[model samples]
Target: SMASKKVCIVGSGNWGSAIAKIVGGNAAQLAQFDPRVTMWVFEEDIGGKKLTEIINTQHENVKYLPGHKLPPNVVAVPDVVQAAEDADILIFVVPHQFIGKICDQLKGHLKANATGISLIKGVDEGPNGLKLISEVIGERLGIPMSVLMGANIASEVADEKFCETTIGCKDPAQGQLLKELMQTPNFRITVVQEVDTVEICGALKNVVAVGAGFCDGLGFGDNTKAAVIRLGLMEMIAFAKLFCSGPVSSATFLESCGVADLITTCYGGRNRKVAEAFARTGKSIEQLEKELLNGQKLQGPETARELYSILQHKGLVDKFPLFMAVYKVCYEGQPVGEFIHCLQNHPEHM
Candidate 1:
């Protein structure tokens, strides 16, 4: 008899709920997986009712994913350990800040042979350098981990719009299985072996999106905006090579995780939107974050700050002109008017 497999999603935010709609539907029909899917919801009170109660009863993530209906079998659990206790496969999709606590709670509790995937983006600063969120999960949970990232927007994917995502896995067989688990007619998947490369792209691209937002704020035309986007991509490739221990291929940047994600985030993601507001409205990043994002930190500026610290420590700040410019404008008092001129003498051009 085939072993019964169970899946748990460790977050219930917008991205987590959107993915649940897909995973919950698949598990019901896929013989390899258990019919019930457990999704961990951070206990919150909305409308004087517990959020998990609402999700379990109504099959809707009304606060985070307002309109999408989750599958009936996708049960919401309030305790992290309880949600993951029987899980044969784990999908971690929490915000970067909460990873440590969540992992501590799940350590030694997860099935020993369980494999997992990260749908989380963003990195943490470590003593040595920047740390990948997937690495943190793998280290804490003792699981072989893969990562999912691409030009995916939660609402669009939930609506079943035509879109593609890349899955980065080391094991080919596991990659194929994950492809089967998540792929839909409209939500497509492509798996690659470049795990770190795929994850690094997810974290660093937000920095580039900040530059794109700067271009928009400065009232630049298509030509200048295009230059920012291309230069930003070059910096991303260069940074990935420096960060990954394994061989990083330039070709991975051509995948959905690379160029495709960069384009979407630069144009449409929250990082870009907040940055544009920073430039156009003459508002502080802190003020804008509170007003525009309801206190959610914009990853672009945050990532830029972290990357800036890493690059400066290594004395490589000059090598990445666009990234440096973004850091200076956001954290320091550099005039937003200098956004384009900062890229004039870019190392890529020289």
Candidate 2:
């Protein structure tokens, strides 16, 4: 049945590769594409990089998990035409910034009757502010698409840890069907009707992660971090109500997409790594890059910066002092101590 049902997975990064791992048995059913990995061979100096070579060879001999075998059912193909020719489903796991170019490239090869889904986590920096990936796909393909969100780090998922995610689409039928296909004992997928709210949950939580991580870097106690999270939750709710046309209040924070994800981001390994970098470097863009690239994780600062720029003007944030303090440390080269002072002196509202 997997071979009969073709799926194309474009963009084989950490997330992409992990998705490939997840769809292991169905790997034979799926095709993988990443132009970056595909085009890397043209560079003059990439000699003997096992991962690069393995991807080029269609993921043969590449390990998604250490000591675990790649699914025998999968066939690796690099060309979009080769991969997309007969695919019934298309999954885009690329970075938010890169989706446009990927979509443009894929437009030529996408097979009709194929439904698309996205697992990317950041907001597109392009002019379309806060639009869901499904919206982006709709713009390009003239078809509705599905989005997946919640507290999942591909690493943990790949390791077979128990997890949960929310799949969203305007059409619950399509969303629930995809959810059923992806569900496993260790991984549970739920369907949500409010797709935009799910995207908002993913985006705004990353911004708040930066704020909470900054607090942790300043050696603030759990109490301070909790306060930051509470206020950030309020801001998140406010923004969801303002920008998103959905009944956000009908959903509970602890169970629904928004607050649950925020909690995970605050305490996740990637957040801890980002916070460690800020603590060690005081404040520098170069240092931020080192932390992210070396640690191989997405730092929340830049997303936070963009979110603040896009939404703050619309009055969709909690108290400004702590956030502005984080901004100074992240973007304006302010010392962490001074920013901490800003937070300490920040006025309390009754």
Candidate 3:
């Protein structure tokens, strides 16, 4: 009531739960934000009990996050509409696949004044043919949107290790408010105005990571892998320059969302890990992902497909050989052996 604003976290996966600990802590400490933060959980059975029931009682996302206790103020609500009904700020961290369905549930339930931030990393089949997830959320929810991304590996963040993140926010007030809600001593934030460029980094990096995995699987040396990562990043810059309507190339590459996430992800992310396994085992990505990821979806292969769909139709595929190569390797059965061959004459070298 009064001038205090209520907040809601619309998804509660590993990343969602990690951010929950921060947001819930900040809300309870900050006076302007309502201390009672609600997390909209997907309501699944976790060994004979409801997931929300456990979160509400134990204050931990034991199944998803495991061992980390969420702040007491962050109550887990089962219904999306109910959780978001009165919130002034919404954090959409749900899986990209479920975004449409979840947003559908909150359509009529959202408050008129609500502003949102998307922690989602996937690009959608978009508002204007393959838009950023934040754009999709903003379009569907009818709210001003901001996005948060970085090299923040969820578990590492939960351990409170020092890491900086980027928040692409156009509005100063909302940016500061979100910065307060998200930052901690170990978790840093830098607010930038390039909202779409920030998110593109998040989605596209996973695709590059898959290529890095191919490099690793091929038993390539550090120089080869470095070159692969380099070209991949160049392609990211080129793609963003074409896709985004804002300042690109230099701005995002320096931010935590771009080179930082890219380096960290290609070196250690799950997509890289699974793709490496796929290279060594010569196994199907789907097979390796199920075995390696413990049911979590791999972002690289899928993002590669979506990106290919977006580029191929526009006759812009050759301009992004690295991206196209990764998509072909992952989805089109292009020999993983030929991964480097496809990059031999990339447009970047010219």
Candidate 4:
């Protein structure tokens, strides 16, 4: 059964759902697991039915533009242990905040020798540079997992639109195996030995993406957007280098995992989904619990919050002016208008 691979993807949010959907088509009955509420609610919100309808109908009919197809191998389920029990390769598509709790629950049931992958893309507010999902698994389950990064958006990937990602693994062989196993027309993978860089790249890009969106929302033009992308990357590198090992390849940013992530964070609505919802509806965090959990904030929100709080606490904030500005806007309640004004006028020390 070791050779017979089955993937269980935890968390049914957009990122989780996308991963689950993709795995379903790729692996043998890849199971999609999540909190019962999320599973049912996500199904209702996305497919207009309960989990059963989503799995039976919409998931079957699910199609992506440019005509990419789902591999005939995916399965969607709501029970967490049930998902974990059958999974030979467990994949986490969860958010940072809840990864630990869920993993703690699944710890007892995980297959004896299964490998796991963490697809979540945010830093823990407490851990500074550690990928939240990986930290949880490592501390609680004593399981070391690989991190998946680069330019992956669930909607586009699910629809089978063209996309690619860099999978970073400490072991070169593991990287190659994952790349070979996961490659698809719409979703391709690149292998990297710098596992820390890949995870950091994945986490850092979200913070920058929010900055880009706030720039757009604040009426900044292409120049501003371009500046954020470039400078923000420097900040990412700075933070990554402090906490993670290895010199980050500049090329990684130009293509699959680097520039690709920047593009999606700026343009993809899923990255911007929660912030947009809060901006329009003026919903409190309590009202927008699901959105907040999935990564979204209004006016430099939680993404901004976690990134700045953790980075500052780590003393990694010396040169990241753009990151600082956005963080202030989101957390310190610095006015967006003034933040824009400062962003336009601020001189880059580097």
* Segments in model 1 whose C-alpha atoms lie over 4 Å from true places: 294-297
TM-score of candidate 1 relative to the true fold: 0.95
Runs of candidate 2 with Cα error greater than 4 angstroms are 1-3, 26-46, 49-52, 55-69, 125-129, 250-252, 283-286, 295-299, 312-325, 338-350
The model with the greatest lDDT is 1
Off by over 4 Å in 3: 126-128
CA RMSD, predictions in order: 1.7, 4.8, 1.8, 5.3
Residue 200 lDDT (model 1): 89
lDDT of 3 by residue, 23-67 (tens): 999999989889999999988887899989899999998766877
Comparing 2 with 3 on lDDT, the higher-scoring candidate is 3
Q: What RMSD value applies to candidate 3?
A: 1.8
List of clashing residue pairs for candidate 4: 24-73, 24-74, 25-71, 64-159, 150-257, 253-258, 253-259
lDDT of 2 by residue, 280-321 (tens): 666465566564754244636666676667556556445555
* Candidate 3 TM-score, C-alpha based: 0.95
In Å, residue 244's CA in model 3 sits off its true spot by 1.7
lDDT of 4: 0.60
How many residue pairs clash in all the candidates, one count each? Answer: 0, 3, 1, 7
Q: List TM-score per model, in order.
A: 0.95, 0.80, 0.95, 0.79
